[PDB]
Ligand binder design. Structure first.
Ligand SMILES: *C1=CC(=O)N(CCN2C(=O)C=C(*)C2=O)C1=O
Ligand SMILES: [Zn+2]
Ligand SMILES: [Zn+2]
Lengths: 72, 196, 68, 76, 76
């Protein structure tokens, strides 16, 4: 449904997107909102680094989950 | 498609300028994200004569997801938290629909004040009292309406109990909370107030 | 969730439709805009009601199902 | 007898009835002009919601009053 | 007031809370005592999985009640 994405800074960012959305989607989709190159961007959820080939449904990122960004 | 929340809200405001005082929405500041609503207690209910203030927040996906609405004014009702004002109402959750407006939302609240659903409660204590002691619930709601919502009158036997308990040195709102939740039995209200 | 629902570009002179307004965005239907008709006969800007139907299976006016 | 109902397109429609008419009557006439089933129809007038079996005479709906339409709601 | 939080292993946690505390506030206190992200906590009492926005008083949870704490997929 909608899900949250916590910065490196501390600001927690809201995104409404579809489970079909590939991880590559979300790197660039996040970059459009307020972000820098997705190639630098790194996404973590439930202890796992999120591979930019897989998609949100593959990691079962449900409604109102929270993703965390770190940098490579 | 762009987030039409501010535009859709602005459009709702231009629409409400054409009508006939039961409900109103107001801006809280320069931010269309954050509004202030007011409803009147519906007639033939214990809220009658009360004016209830609403904290309305408009998510950026509006109108694709519901506004977040809460009672600022305290109220005694099974489907509203007597503490926080959080409303359990299906059109604010699973049953939102985009054609709805803040107008129809507040009218729906007014309708809810007159149509408690105690078997699926937001506030179990109010719901229990609503089912077990309908008379006591009606008086408790009217007292909350009087104390907190400007309603005309409330029952003297209940406000005498509030006065005796506050004279002991307890804050009225704490007294009122204690008596209402203990079904106006002074003995157990006093024990709750004394406890730490 | 991809529907063959009827879609037609709005024409203010060939207006055989009851509704003049899209209740999702609350703007009028305007010429050359793609509208979408749900099985309950309610019409909207396709861009609007398609967004709603991505996340909901229901008509945003009357709540009728939009799939069966 | 002509009364108004503000509907779920935000707009007001004009209804030809009489005070003798049940709310079920008024609700059925509203599904004519607007496509919302009586089931989903809920009529509120001046903060009071209207039950089907009563009449605009019962509720004292006269002249060109406005009823307000909302989708059915349920406290939970 | 005191409530108790029991896990499936058997450990009981004691918290100081107020009836006014939201469930989210309560999960926060469990974190301060056990390190568990609120994300991962599910609190059960009297047939209900508790919702973050409701308070203990909203669920009529009184002093010396015992809540069940069930955890989530931490692995993913
Ligand atoms: C409305 C009434 C009701 O009981 N429910 C869901 C069942 N339920 C419990 O019994 C305790 C918590 C809960 O969700 C409704 O939706
Ligand atoms: Zn539209
Ligand atoms: Zn419809």
């Amino acid at each position: 449904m909608q899900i949250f994405v916590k910065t490196l800074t501390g600001k927690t960012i809201t995104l409404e997107v579809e489970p079909s959305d590939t991880i590559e989607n979300v790197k660039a989709k996040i970059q459009d909102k307020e972000g820098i190159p997705p190639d630098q961007q790194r996404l973590i959820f439930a202890g796992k680094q999120l591979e930019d080939g897989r998609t949100l449904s593959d990691y079962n990122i449900q409604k109102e989950s929270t993703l965390h960004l770190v940098l490579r | 498609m762009a987030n039409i929340a501010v535009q859709r809200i602005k459009r709702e405001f231009k629409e409400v300028l054409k009508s006939e005082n039961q409900i109103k929405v107001d801006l809280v500041d320069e931010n269309f994200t954050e509004l202030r609503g007011e409803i009147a207690g519906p007639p033939d209910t214990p809220y009658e004569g009360g004016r209830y203030q609403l904290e309305i927040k408009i998510p950026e996906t509006y109108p694709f997801n519901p506004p977040k609405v809460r009672f600022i004014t305290k109220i005694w009702h099974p489907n509203i938290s007597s503490v926080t004002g959080a409303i359990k109402l299906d059109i604010l959750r699973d049953q939102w629909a985009a054609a709805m407006t803040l107008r129809t939302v507040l009218l729906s609240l007014q309708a809810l004040l007159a149509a408690a659903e105690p078997d699926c409660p937001q506030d179990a204590v109010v719901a229990n009292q609503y089912k077990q002691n309908p008379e006591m619930f009606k008086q408790t709601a009217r007292l909350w309406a009087h104390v907190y919502a400007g309603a005309p009158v409330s029952s003297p036997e209940y406000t005498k109990k509030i006065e005796n308990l506050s004279a002991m040195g307890f804050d009225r709102n704490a007294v009122i909370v204690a008596l209402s939740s203990k079904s106006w039995d002074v003995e157990t209200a006093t024990e709750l107030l004394l406890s730490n | 969730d991809i529907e063959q629902l009827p879609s037609y570009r709005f024409n203010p002179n060939n207006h055989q439709s009851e509704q003049t307004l899209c209740v999702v965005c609350m703007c009028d239907f305007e010429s050359r805009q793609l509208l979408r008709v749900l099985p309950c006969n309610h019409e909207f800007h396709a861009k609007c009601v398609d967004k709603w139907l991505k996340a909901n299976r229901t008509c945003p006016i009357c709540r009728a199902d939009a799939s069966e």
